[PDB]
Amino acid sequence: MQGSRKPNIIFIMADDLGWGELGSYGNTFNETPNLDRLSAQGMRFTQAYAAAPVASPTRASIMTGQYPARVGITDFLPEDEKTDRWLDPTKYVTLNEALSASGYHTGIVGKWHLDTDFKLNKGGPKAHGFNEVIGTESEYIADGDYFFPYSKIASFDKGTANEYLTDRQCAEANAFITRNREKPFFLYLSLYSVHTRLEAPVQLVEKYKQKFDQKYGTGKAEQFFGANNVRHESAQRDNPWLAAMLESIDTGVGGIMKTLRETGLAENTIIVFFSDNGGAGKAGNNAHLRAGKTWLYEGGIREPLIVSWPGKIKGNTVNDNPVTSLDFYPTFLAAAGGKPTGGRLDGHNLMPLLRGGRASGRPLFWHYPSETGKWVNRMSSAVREGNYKLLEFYNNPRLELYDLQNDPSESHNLATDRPAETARLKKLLEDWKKEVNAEAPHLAR
């Protein structure tokens, strides 16, 4: 049946995928032709942020549209026994629910990480009200399992011999699209890749091993990523394993793009590609940005963001205006013709910015007391307003001020030479910490 429908929203989020990994973000070693095509057909954001440097909190910010620091989940959820924290369906109108109330059929394929209690799972995707829950974790994901049978995903009872998890998740996204082709749907495709431990089909690893050898010289893939290197992690840039895993994600995104064309849904479907936090040390490529996962330096919070909506969003555009994972909830609600019912949101509707509208300045905030990692040197809070970013560290207490425009690698601390800017950003950060009841860092007394 033809006629106006509210547009499908497909949200594709990689796990721990760095800002410097995609071909569109300047990477020449990895191959992401499908994502680069999605980029040439959409708007690419160079200053997109996860609202936290770790899994659970960014996922919290997406499903609640609220500051992780306000929710009280600022660090990844560990195994059940190491935490009393979970996302409570009675405490938030989640994004899937707001879309349900706007006439959408809702689906999650894969990683939740908003409840690590599997005995009762009161805060699982089903309990939050997803119409379809497909291949979500059935136990603490931990170091992972990427090959059928998937030891972390009991609900994937059926599969083929040595089936790769990324390939499975992307096939389930295709079938979900086809089953639900006739009505508005929200599909949250929550990839386990590229979370350590790094695993990819041998032929893809062999391919990037040889490409590593061609780039660096004969034997270099064995020298740096041989049987010796058990987790395939190194200080060498260009990781054949992450490249092979990113090729499986990329080929998967191409299957979804193909399925949308075939089913006639491309013209009325919003496609977002995002990552929940910065690249992981010894695995990920955050380009020239400082540090990565678990740090509030740019490398831990800067993410690839591609938004495609054919004939609504101009193709092959680059947007430098800062945005965060808080912005998705109000953006999807505007596209769905919905209004937040009582629900308060800490993000802003991006649809006017996506349609070529002029940008508007707003302070952006982060808080990482590392309640789970206990990373004393990484414990910190941050405000960005304009090009200035202020980081407050709690162990070795200090302020760091960077001009991200002139110093995007955060290599020159300005706090001392620019005290009035420092004092002005400190006041915004302190006010925000009281507004959200920011959790004190876990340090000695």
Binding site for a second copy (CB under 8 A): 157-164, 167-168, 170-171, 174-175, 178, 201-203, 248, 251-252, 255
Q: Under the criterion CB under 5 A, does residue 140 sit at the interface with Na ion?
A: no
Q: Which residue bears the tokens 């706007």?
A: 102
Could you tell me where the DSSP H helices lie in 101-218? Answer: 125-128, 165-179, 202-216
Q: Work out what residue 202 binds among Br ion, Na ion, a second copy, none; the CB cut-off runs from 5 to 8 Å by kind.
A: a second copy
Q: Is 120 helix (H, G, I), strand (E, B) or coil?
A: coil
- Binding residue for Br ion, selected from 13, 22, 48, 55, defined by CB under 5 A: 55
Q: How far is the CB of 163 from a second copy (least distance, A)?
A: 6
DSSP state of 264: T
Say whether residue 82 binds Br ion (CB under 5 A): no
Cβ proximity to Ca ion: between 54 and 260 the closer is 54
d(CA 200, CA 246): 9
CB atoms inside a 10 Å sphere around CB 349: 16
Residue 377 sits in the site that holds Br ion (CB under 5 A): yes
CB 8 within 8 A of CB 184: yes
Nearer to Ca ion, 196 or 277 (CB): 277
**Is the Cβ of residue 203 or residue 396 nearer to a second copy in the bound state?**
203
| Contact partner at residue 316 from a second copy, Na ion, Br ion, none, CB < 5 to 8 Å by partner kind | none
Q: Which two tokens stand for residue 48?
A: 């997109």
Exposure b/e, 34-57, CB count within 10 A at least 16 = b: bbbbbbebbbbbbbbbbbbbbbbb
Query: CA–CA separation, 147 vs 204, rounded Å?
Result: 14
Neighbours of 434 (CB within 10 A): 8
144 binds Na ion (CB under 5 A): no
CB-wise, 227 or 235, nearer to a second copy? 227
Least distance in angstroms from the C-beta of 331 to Br ion: 25
Using the rule CB under 5 A, which residue among 5, 72, 78, 80 binds Na ion? Answer: 80
Under a CB-based contact definition with an 8 Å cutoff, are residues 74 and 371 in contact?
yes
- Contact positions toward Ca ion, by CB under 5 A? 15-16, 55, 276-277
Going by C-beta distance under 8 Å and a sequence separation of 6 or more, which residues neighbour residue 434? none
- Torsion over CA: 35, 40, 42, 46 (sign): positive
Torsion of CA 330, 331, 334, 340, to 10 degrees: -10
Residue number of the CB atom closest to Ca ion: 55
Q: What is the distance between the alpha carbons of residues 404 and 412, in angstroms, rounded to a whole number?
A: 10
Out of 19, 45, 76, 185, which residue is the one contacting Br ion (CB under 5 A)? Answer: 76
- What residues between 90 and 129 interact with Na ion by CB under 5 A? 94, 117
User: Considering beta carbons, is residue 15 or 233 the nearer one to Ca ion?
Assistant: 15
Residues 101, 118, 126, 147: which binds Na ion (CB under 5 A)? 147
> Any contact of residue 420 with Br ion (CB under 5 A)?
yes
Site mask, Br ion, residues 389-418, x = CB under 5 A? -----------------------------x
Q: What does the binding site for Br ion look like in residue numbers (CB under 5 A)?
A: 1-2, 55, 76, 377, 418, 420-421, 426-427, 430
